[PDB]
Amino acid sequence: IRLGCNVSAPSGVLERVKELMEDYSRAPDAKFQQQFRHLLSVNFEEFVAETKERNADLDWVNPKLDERLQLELGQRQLEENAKKRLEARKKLPTMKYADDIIQAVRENQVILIVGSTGCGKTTQVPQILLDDAISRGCASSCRIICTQPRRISAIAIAEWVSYERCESLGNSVGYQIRLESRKARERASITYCTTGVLLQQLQSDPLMHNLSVLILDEIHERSVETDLLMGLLKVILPHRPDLKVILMSATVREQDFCDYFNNCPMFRIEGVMFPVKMLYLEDVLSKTNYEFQKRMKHEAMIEPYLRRIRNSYDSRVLDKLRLPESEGCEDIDFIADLVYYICENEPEGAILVFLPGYDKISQLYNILDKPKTSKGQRWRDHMAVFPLHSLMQSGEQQAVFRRPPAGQRKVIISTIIAETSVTIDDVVYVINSGRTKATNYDIETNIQSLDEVWVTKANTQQRRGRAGRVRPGICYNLFSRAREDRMDDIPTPEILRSKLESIILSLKLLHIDDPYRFLQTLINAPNPEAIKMGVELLKRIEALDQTGTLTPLGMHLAKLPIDPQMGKMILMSALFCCLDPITSAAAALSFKSPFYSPLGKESRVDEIKRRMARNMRSDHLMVHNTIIAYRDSRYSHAERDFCYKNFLSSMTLQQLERMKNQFSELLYNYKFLASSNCKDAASNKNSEKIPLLRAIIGAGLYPNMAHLRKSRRAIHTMATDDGRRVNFHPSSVNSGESGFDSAYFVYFQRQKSTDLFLLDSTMVFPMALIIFGDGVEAGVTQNTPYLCVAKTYYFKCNRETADVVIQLRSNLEKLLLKKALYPAPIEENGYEKQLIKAIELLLSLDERL
DNA sequence: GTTAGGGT
Known part of the structure; x- marks a missing residue:
């Protein structure tokens, strides 16, 4: 010492x-102490009764209002501001299944709707079940809450679903996220909110008595919060029979959730995109014939694959597939060459380039902006190049989304951000290096590490659709199919990488006193060793006592x-x-x-x-x-x-x-x-x-x-x-x-x-x-x-x-x-x-x- | 000498 x-x-x-x-x-005068002591005394059966009585507002309906809106819906459907709004709505694939969804929701507690981006499930399924309830003369009994993973999406979707109804926000559609809310009217309403908002609202209404319908959107993304939400629904739905849940997912292991809710009915709704041609690394080098010059493990993967395509691709190309540095974003001048190739051939459109992090994005910008090649200097002043990173200013400005100057091409050099969060509408061509960054917690050494890793199949699939907004596009994947064959299905559900004290403490307010028992009932069960590590932290800061009670x-x-x-x-x-x-x-x-x-x-x-x-x-x-x-x-x-x-x-x-x-x-x-x-x-x-x-x-x-x-x-x-x-x-x-x-x-x-x-x-x-x-x-x-x-x-x-x-x-x-x-x-x-x-x-x- | 992406 x-x-x-x-x-x-x-x-x-x-x-x-x-x-x-x-x-x-x-x-x-300590009311708090009596509240704290009550929470510790009551068991769950008693907890269930009290939250019933305390949240009974929806046990009340408004017949004078029921009727007025039913009268007003039929009347305002015949105006010449609507009926054009309905006809354009009926071009969406989801609206073709409206009457079946109504029935499946009537006949079942939990249904699941699986549909690709473009299907309109998210703007339309909320409207479909409200307008039905209003006409049936039931309007004031209907309060639909629909979650989103992201704040920005929650608003612009609500501003849109409000525009498809010729209304200002806060009449029949609303949004509510943290610290900012345009709330809807109380009854006969659609409220868009982030999953976090709903989770905080459970403290007061833990058995969801203050809604009639629950829509969980983007469940396939496996956010902690949707993952958490589905576990809790298993606890709630036996005590809430009148409650209707509608889960919603992409075509990314949709079956995990259908299994999870016991074999529930599942609609598949088709999308509305342009087809985007998938090219892999062999097909890229065949079009550019780029040359690289300045553990294997690599050879185990590439030679069995090169053999299956010995007669299908060029010989000089396939030798570069042996070079470890051809795949990924290891050679920036290679990635530099493919953009210059798009700028000359392949018709007009923007280039969205997917790179792992700040460092690799910075490298290519300078290559495109301050090139060392003659082919680079030829192009530099005919490209308007945008790096796209959270820590960079571009997201909060209007340029990168809009069209380039005349005669200049937009090239967006982005991390994983433009896959879901950011959407640029004039992209035609997507260069997918297939490399990303991820944060990994090793339970045993107490080290969080930040690593470059391969992406998954769900990700590339997401990046391919990024090219089909305006017209048919192309997606260049800078890895061979032999890499894709060994890539994971989806990313690790992030609940498996996350610290757990904050959930464990929250679960105590939902009278879920045992975190080991509960967290095991999730789709992916968290490490019980990370569950214990949670309690110890909480015990140390003395938010739990030594018995583990709150x-x-x-x-x-x-x-x-x-x-x-x-x-x-x-x-x-x-x-x-x-x-x-x-x-x-x-x-x-x-x-x-x-x-x-x-x-x-x-x-x-x-x-x-x-x-x-x-x-x-x-x-x-x-x-x-x-x-x-x-x-x-x-x-x-x-x-x-x-x-x-x-x-x-x-x-x-x-x-x-x-x-x-x-x-x-x-x-x-x-x-x-x-x-x-x-x-x-x-x-x-x-x-x-x-x-x-x-x-x-x-x-x-x-x-x-x-x-x-x-x-x-x-x-x-x-x-x-x-x-x-x-x-x-x-x-x-x-x-x-x-x-x-x-x-x-x-x-x-x-x-x-x-x-x-x-x-x-x-x-x-x-x-x-x-x-x-x-x-x-x-x-x-x-x-x-x-x-x-x-x-x-x-x-x-x-x-x-x-x-x-x-x-x-x-x-x-x-x-x-x-x-x-x-x-x-x-x-x-x-x-x-x-x-x-x-x-x-x-x-x-x-x-x- | 360096920063994947969400959210109450």
């Missing part, structure tokens, strides 16, 4: 701490729309009065960093984050500094200029700004804040005290701690608390910096690509870790008294300061318990406040002089 720096405090300070604690310990803190954490660690972080900042910077920290780690990453400028972006980080040496405080800057730029009417100067997305920041209010309002409604404003001065008296912020940041990111040991940009010798050597990711503002006032760091995500990096970090002090962490004991090991945290880091500490810090952790642990059970804002001159001021004082001993 080694010994860190001395953390003993001056005598005058410990004397004040003991006095303030003596005050705290001279202390002697605790009063844990109910608050389950009622916040954020992972419990940062949920717990936010709650501390209410009790310690630093609300605004902390909820900036939380929204950022949950959602994402508002900074773009434009091509070439990465060096300049470092300088911007360095200036925004204000030498506070923390990525989380850096974003808050950005958010305070963004607010000032609104106050100056310089917002646009501000965002163009610092590579910032105003869309993100306003959404980051919205999450903070959602955080503040919840905390206020929960009785932890006196004001729902995240900016209010009382909620923020300590928002200027940096050593306090680092201590509340650490309370949430603990126990992901790092220790740094070397100085030289600067070279770093740093290891996480488990012994593995790490670095700051080059994107984090702590990369390369020297002269840290402290050698201890907390981080949210660590990840391996070319090294094991901490993607974000805040510099923290040993005293603050000791007070908010665990694994604390006082002792002697050398001939020195020590103080440790996580039983991992041992700090020189005299006895007088230890017995105060331990006594301080006792009182802190007593305060947090009572606040979870009996939430109220901390009064300014009460007993509770003295213990707070005792911690504020001990943490300011670490202030930068």
